[PDB]
Each structure stands twice: as C-alpha cells, then as structure tokens.
C-alpha cells in the first residue's frame, strides 16, 4: 500500500464501519492483502465475498465507479462474474470518511466459486473454453454504454506503466527510442465498435475459477479501452511466462494455444482475421509495459541480483525489439 495511505488508515475503526455497512461480522473478515489495496475475505450466510479498500489519494470514487458499471453490464448479459454485491445501502461503493478530507472505498464483490485450473485441466479442452468465454465477454462489452464522462475508464495509451521516461532511469536512450516507435506503430490502427472497447486488459489463467466445468473470472481492477486482439495477446503474454504446465517449444506452444483458444472464440465474437498479424506487437507492447512496471516497483539501488538480472534482459529484448514469439499467427486465419 502507498506510504501517505498506510499513515491514515486505522484497520479497526475502516472495518467497523464495513460491519455496519455490509452485515459481517469481524470475526468473518480475514486480511488477504495490502498490495493496491486492502483486501480481506468475508463470510456471510456460508457463502464468500472479497472486500476492496482504497482510498482517493490513490483512486476516485467515479474512476472504479466505471468498473462497477461494467461488470453490470456483462452479469445481466449473462456472463460469469465475480460481481459486486451492494450494501445495506444499496451501494457497490462505500465511501468512509477518514477525518481529514478523503474517504476510504470499500466495495464488495462475490468470490469466484470453484477453484484454479489444476495440472490434469490444462489442455487444449481448457483453452478452447477460455476462447469461448472471451468471445462472450468481448461480444457483451460492444453493447455497454458509459453512463457519463465522469465514469471514464483510461485508453490503452494512458496506462501509467507505458510511461517509461517517469520511472526509467533518462540514459536509456534505445530503450525509449523502441518504446515510442512500437506506441506510434499501434496509435495508427483502427479502433471502432468491432475492434475495441472496456475490456479486462491483464487476463491471466488465474483470472479464472473453475466450478465442475463452468468458468468464472475474477479480480477487474484495472480494466480500460483497448483492442481486443490486445485482451487476447495479453492472456498470451502471461500464459507464456507461467503456464500451468512448462512448455519447452515456445512457437509450437503459442500456436496452439492460440489455435485452439480461436476456435473457442469464433463460436462468440467476429473478429477480422487481420488482427492475427499484430499478435507479436501486441506481445512486445506488454513487455515493454513490464519493464515500466518493474521500474515503478522497485527501488533500483535496492534490487537483488536476480532483479537486476531480469531487468538487463527485459532492457536488452526492447532494445534489440525482440520477438516474444516467432509463430506465425497469420496461418490461424479462418
């Protein structure tokens, strides 16, 4: 958690007010985190909730208020979520006044029934299934109407983390140079109601719960505008790094993940085959928002060897504009 939260935040009295508000009991609140945010799980009537605290110092109240309304949006079109849960007040957030000119924002959210995708899961079934629920999700964003401005979520160019020259020490020159050019490179494509919308923007297979058969994700923090052939490349992107099971062909990998994720896809959204040939940009554009990452994390001077060891070849792949993966997903077109 942020340093000028940490100095306000008083546990007790934050979580009192949560009993007030949402009818659970303190001895059925367990601290889960304090990362982004303050997360606890919450036990009420045997079923579970999570319970999300930030604080405006950090966050507005009309920034995740745009969250909320999009995960409305996709339950009452049908789709599983782990959804927010109103309070006694009829609220997805709660604003708590911390005594001296901010609030605390507490909001509730169902707990993803069933569990992670285990070893003896994860298979070509499993991706197929992970296309089919994408398509779904992508096909329901396109009828989402914002409801105000106020509620705006970011677009793809003004995620914090493409911000390199703020946390990345000013001498890598090359590194910026790549940077700019991928970030002028994909400003240039097209975005309308078929190719981009509110989308999750950082899926990972464990942004997926699995109850006998039937999917269900969770954990929407940071959703935003993007492309969704990027929502794709992203689950992608992370799956390549910690895939359930190790791969050791990386392209052959790639390949039939993505074959198999499409045919699932196909069945639920339109998307023009033209977007298989900016899967690797796409896949670059996520590293590169990881070394931003990484460097807004740490503290440089502070970073053990094996740190610095990943930061050298992050920086040495942007610079040389390494491909993540050399398959060639044009041949997946249909």
Same mark, same amino acid.
């Given at each position: *958690?942020?340093?000028?939260?940490?100095?306000?935040?008083?546990?007790?009295? $934050?979580?009192?007010?949560? @009993?007030?508000? %949402?009818?659970?009991?303190?001895?059925?609140?367990?601290?889960?985190?304090? !990362?982004?945010?303050?997360?606890?799980?919450?036990?009420?009537?045997?079923?579970?909730?999570?319970?999300?605290?930030?604080?405006?110092?950090?966050? #507005?109240?009309?920034?995740?208020? /745009?969250?909320?309304?999009?995960?409305?949006?996709? !339950?009452?079109?049908?789709?599983?979520?782990?959804?927010?849960?109103?309070?006694? +007040?009829?609220?997805?957030?709660?604003?708590?006044?911390?005594?001296?000119?901010?609030?605390?924002?507490?909001?509730?959210?169902?707990?993803?029934?069933?569990?992670?995708?285990?070893? !003896?899961?994860?298979?070509?079934?499993?991706? %197929?299934?992970? /296309?089919?629920? &994408?398509?779904?999700?992508?096909?329901?964003?396109?009828?989402?109407?914002?409801? =105000?401005?106020?509620?705006?979520?970011?677009?793809?160019?003004?995620?914090?983390?493409?911000?390199?020259?703020?946390?990345?020490?000013?001498?890598?020159?090359?590194?910026?140079?790549?940077?700019?050019?991928?970030?002028?490179?994909?400003?240039?494509?097209?975005? +309308?109601? =078929?190719?981009?919308?509110?989308?999750?923007? =950082?899926?990972?297979?464990?942004?997926?719960?699995?109850?006998?058969?039937? $999917? &269900? @994700?969770?954990?929407?923090?940071?959703?935003?505008?993007?492309?969704?052939?990027?929502?794709?490349?992203?689950?992608? %992107?992370?799956?390549?790094?910690?895939?359930?099971?190790?791969?050791? =062909?990386?392209?052959?990998?790639?390949?039939?993940? *993505?074959?198999?994720?499409?045919?699932?896809?196909?069945?639920?959204?339109?998307?023009?085959?033209?977007?298989?040939?900016? $899967?690797?940009?796409?896949?670059?554009?996520?590293?590169?928002?990881?070394? /931003?990452?990484?460097?807004? !994390?740490?503290?440089?001077?502070?970073?053990?060897?094996?740190?610095?060891? *990943?930061?050298?070849?992050?920086?040495?792949?942007?610079?040389?504009?390494?491909?993540?993966?050399?398959?060639?997903? @044009?041949?997946? #077109?249909?």
């Amino acid at each position: *958690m942020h340093k000028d939260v940490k100095a306000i935040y008083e546990e007790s009295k $934050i979580l009192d007010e949560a @009993t007030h508000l %949402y009818g659970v009991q303190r001895s059925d609140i367990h601290f889960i985190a304090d !990362a982004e945010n303050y997360v606890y799980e919450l036990k009420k009537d045997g079923e579970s909730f999570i319970l999300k605290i930030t604080h405006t110092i950090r966050r #507005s109240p009309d920034y995740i208020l /745009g969250e909320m309304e999009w995960l409305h949006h996709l !339950a009452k079109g049908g789709l599983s979520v782990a959804k927010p849960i109103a309070s006694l +007040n009829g609220r997805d957030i709660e604003q708590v006044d911390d005594g001296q000119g901010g609030s605390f924002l507490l909001r509730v959210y169902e707990k993803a029934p069933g569990h992670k995708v285990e070893e !003896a899961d994860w298979n070509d079934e499993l991706f %197929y299934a992970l /296309g089919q629920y &994408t398509g779904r999700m992508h096909k329901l964003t396109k009828s989402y109407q914002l409801s =105000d401005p106020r509620y705006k979520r970011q677009e793809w160019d003004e995620e914090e983390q493409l911000k390199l020259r703020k946390y990345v020490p000013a001498d890598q020159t090359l590194v910026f140079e790549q940077a700019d050019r991928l970030m002028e490179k994909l400003a240039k494509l097209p975005k +309308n109601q =078929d190719t981009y919308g509110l989308v999750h923007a =950082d899926l990972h297979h464990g942004n997926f719960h699995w109850d006998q058969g039937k $999917i &269900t @994700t969770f954990d929407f923090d940071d959703i935003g505008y993007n492309w969704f052939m990027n929502d794709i490349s992203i689950l992608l %992107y992370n799956v390549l790094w910690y895939p359930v099971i190790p791969y050791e =062909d990386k392209a052959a990998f790639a390949g039939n993940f *993505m074959k198999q994720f499409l045919k699932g896809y196909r069945e639920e959204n339109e998307l023009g085959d033209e977007w298989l040939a900016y $899967i690797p940009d796409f896949l670059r554009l996520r590293h590169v928002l990881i070394y /931003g990452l990484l460097h807004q !994390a740490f503290d440089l001077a502070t970073i053990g060897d094996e740190e610095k060891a *990943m930061l050298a070849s992050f920086r040495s792949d942007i610079e040389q504009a390494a491909p993540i993966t050399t398959f060639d997903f @044009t041949k997946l #077109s249909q």
